[PDB]
Amino acid sequence: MATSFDNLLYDLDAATGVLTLTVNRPAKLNALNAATIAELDTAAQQALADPAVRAILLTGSGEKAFVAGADIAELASLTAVQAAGASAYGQRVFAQFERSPKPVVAAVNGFALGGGCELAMACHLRVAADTARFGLPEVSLGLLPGYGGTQRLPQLVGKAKALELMLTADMIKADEALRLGLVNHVVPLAELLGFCQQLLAKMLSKGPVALGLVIECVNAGYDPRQDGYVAETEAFGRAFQTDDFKEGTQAFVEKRPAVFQGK
Amino acid sequence: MATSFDNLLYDLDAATGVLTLTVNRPAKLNALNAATIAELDTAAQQALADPAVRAILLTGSGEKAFVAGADIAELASLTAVQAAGASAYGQRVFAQFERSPKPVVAAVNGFALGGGCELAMACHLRVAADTARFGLPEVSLGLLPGYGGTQRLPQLVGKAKALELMLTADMIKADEALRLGLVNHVVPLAELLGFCQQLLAKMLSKGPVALGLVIECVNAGYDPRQDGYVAETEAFGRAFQTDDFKEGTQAFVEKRPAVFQGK
Amino acid sequence: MATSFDNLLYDLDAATGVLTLTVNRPAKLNALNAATIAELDTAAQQALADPAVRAILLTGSGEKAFVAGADIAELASLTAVQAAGASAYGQRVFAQFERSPKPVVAAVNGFALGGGCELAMACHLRVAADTARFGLPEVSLGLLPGYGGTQRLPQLVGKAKALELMLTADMIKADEALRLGLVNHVVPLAELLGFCQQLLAKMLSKGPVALGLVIECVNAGYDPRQDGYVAETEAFGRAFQTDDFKEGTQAFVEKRPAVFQGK
């Protein structure tokens, strides 16, 4: 469980604290399979535990695919009970990115299909390249999205267009995804990584604890078992106690930059 | 079996499996009344129990209104008690279209107002003509939308624009509905039926059981009484124990067309 | 006294019934403080009790600001518990506008930041001036929104852009806010308070009991504890029991105008 993966690259930029996680099966269009999910799990677990990781930039190797579906031969080999288990597992692994108190941005450099679209939707923000494509083609196999897609797509583009995309299996381009709300920004592919780093810069100059509480409180709003207003009030007093608030307020009245430490 | 109706037209096309259901009161702009609601209840149940029915296309007769309001003089002759009951009934009836495992597409050919707007909103997809208009005028009469509009309009349009439409009783053009998310597509009235046929054709080439499982799963993300992710996991195992799934995966690896049977 | 506030202007037009509430601290850009927030409390309570108040228009003093932040010096002086209590109190006060049976429009004539952006978001509707700018820069201090902004901004803007705004502290113009759903309309500053009067005119011609019943029922669809369909059914029967509904219904049949009275 160190930093050595057969299907991912794990490049920590000690300097910015941004960790680039790259899905790295280029001859397979960065498709998912049992091993890659499990490595995603391990990678995510380690980044959350490492103080030097301040944020996560997720992406795919090459210029054609972010994550383009999954190994269908692997998938077909499972029984129904194992398939229910693989779905429960993929939901847990992806949810680890959604629930993470460190900002997680998906840099969509190509096809984001199926489990790959579902991976991108689990992150807090998406930035797509000119040439990016999205879609949930599971019904074309007599399947349905099993990694949260039936939950996350409606919350990003609404009920009607989530149904249309999941019922027709349509594949859309970056400009449509932008218009629907599936990605936050579209930019040329050559500019993709750099734009995301600028965007992470804008967040990594804010209170790290404050970042985590915001992500937590937004998540609570979308979970009917959680009360987001109560969580928000407790987060508010919690952030108030931190050294970073005492520092953030000093830097605001004195009009100097704030030095946040996560405390 | 008794598919003859005073106020509806039940034309099942036996090649495609598409049931066209037409509201047939063009002299009264297809308004709703106790009889029409009850026929839609009956037709929906027949549509959902007939294996020949693979999808539903809902439209208005006479190319001037989809469904424009409801027989208000009929409504006024009810006690407050019966009125609450008529509300529960109408919204139970509409929910049959929302919860239908067979895709339901509303082809809005003209005015969709009040209960007629709520009927359109209860379908999975809405395609509208250039000349269609949407609104919820119930406050004009000292009433409120009583067939799900206060719930479904926010889902499609966001809380803010939903409050506006229902508090101002504004009528809006199909261009404005397709911008807020209230319809998926706008076309000239003469292409409306042809467009809806192409769109239904995309879905009917997919796994019939998978379609219905998608609909069940985005529905559970919207009612707090159901988990959602757990629904998706149970539906994902369900898809795996179907003939259609073995066929879909084989057809994918062999790169050939898939022949789904709904099993 | 009756309408005697150090920080607010309580101007009630006795004809139309529009109460105009102006946060009045233009030297500090209408920044909130404990006194202003408590005064907005009593203003709201007073407005809901007064039968001559039929709507609320909320705005800021000058050309520069709507409500720009909060007195950070005052805030930093609280204990950790007192801050939590301030968050609890401020979401209670802002929810009075959200839950009001009387419609509440915010006219955002300039800067709407932090607390002020959260105050705008609690109102049913927002009309912006073209010079308006919005933001939640709490994370720049190591805080997070503590007046419901973590809950209401996703409702207005969706998860992805709510996260981006709260985590980047980006300021946006009314151009982008309209595009995102954060305001309903954009008009020139010169036209702003006139537009809102025209908009309040559409609602004040409708059944007053019915306006607050839609506001109840929309709110119930966002509360996971409530079940908005049941609440809509109870509202429909309660509407029937009012004289405005008999008035409203009689007037539609005998195709004539309608004089509502709110009872």
Side-chain angles (χ1 to χ4, degrees), chain C residues 78-213:
Chain C
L78 311 183
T79 60
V81 176
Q82 289 168 319
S87 167
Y89 182 56
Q91 60 193 26
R92 213 197 310 147
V93 166
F94 292 179
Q96 263 178 347
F97 297 118
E98 169 170 82
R99 286 159 165 69
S100 164
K102 298 165 181 179
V104 174
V105 173
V108 189
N109 60 278
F111 289 127
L113 297 173
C117 192
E118 301 182 91
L119 176 63
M121 283 177 321
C123 303
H124 306 124
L125 302 122
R126 282 149 304 284
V127 181
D130 54 11
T131 55
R133 319 272 144 103
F134 306 82
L136 293 175
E138 269 83 356
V139 292
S140 311
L141 313 162
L143 274 200
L144 87 171
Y147 293 152
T150 63
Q151 305 314 292
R152 290 194 179 95
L153 181 68
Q155 291 165 358
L156 293 180
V157 132
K159 195 189 192 178
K161 289 274 162 195
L163 282 168
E164 184 182 1
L165 288 157
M166 291 186 278
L167 299 163
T168 62
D170 276 356
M171 198 162 70
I172 65 169
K173 308 164 200 284
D175 308 62
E176 178 74 349
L178 180 69
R179 184 196 335 291
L180 291 181
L182 176 56
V183 309
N184 299 61
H185 298 293
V186 180
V187 296
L189 179 48
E191 310 178 19
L192 170 59
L193 283 78
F195 190 93
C196 298
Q197 298 232 287
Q198 284 170 354
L199 190 88
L200 292 176
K202 291 182 180 186
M203 294 161 222
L204 294 151
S205 78
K206 317 290 181 281
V209 50
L211 290 170
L213 283 179

Side-chain angles (χ1 to χ4, degrees), chain B residues 66-81:
Chain B
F66 175 83
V67 172
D71 197 324
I72 282 133
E74 195 182 75
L75 206 53
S77 77
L78 284 265
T79 73
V81 172

